[PDB]
Design a protein around this ligand. Structure first.
Ligand SMILES: *[C@@H]1O[C@H](CO)[C@@H](O[C@@H]2O[C@H](CO)[C@@H](O)[C@H](O)[C@H]2NC(C)=O)[C@H](O)[C@H]1NC(C)=O
Ligand SMILES: *[C@@H]1O[C@H](CO)[C@@H](O)[C@H](O)[C@H]1NC(C)=O
Lengths: 50, 50
């Protein structure tokens, strides 16, 4: 990152005089696709023997 | 039967897969009718050596 040092002192305060109102997005998943598989047809396939 | 109990409580359960049964099974082959060279292979005596 941009390496910099702060002008620290034991009698100095830095106070803002302006503000920026910013808007920030943030994206979160909440759900997966509701899948479902079937034993008797996947493993076997329309087959009585299997 | 699948839940394995005699009293099922409220809710949507899954029983099985369903599929439409096969009706009027069909078999298909080519049209040629020529018995393959069977006699030319067995009914002979001058079989070669191994
Ligand atoms: C504090 O910051 C705001 C940032 O918008 C300054 O507002 C701008 O001021 C300049 C000149 O004063 C204008 O040309 C811009 O159009 C202003 N921005 C907007 C969005 O209107 C404001 O001036 C700053 N405070 C002081 C005291 O200067
Ligand atoms: C071979 O010859 C025998 C003789 O008895 C006959 O029975 C048989 O049908 C013949 N088969 C073929 C493939 O020619």
């Amino acid at each position: 990152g941009a390496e910099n040092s702060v002008a620290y002192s034991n009698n100095s305060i830095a106070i803002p005089t302006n503000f920026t109102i910013s808007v920030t997005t943030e994206i979160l998943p909440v759900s997966m696709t509701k899948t479902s598989v079937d034993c008797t047809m996947y493993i076997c396939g329309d087959s009585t023997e299997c | 039967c699948t839940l394995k109990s005699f009293t099922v409580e409220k809710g949507i359960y899954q029983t099985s897969n369903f599929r439409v049964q096969p009706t009027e099974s069909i078999v298909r082959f080519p049209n040629i009718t020529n018995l393959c060279p069977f006699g030319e292979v067995f009914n002979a005596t001058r079989f070669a050596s191994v």
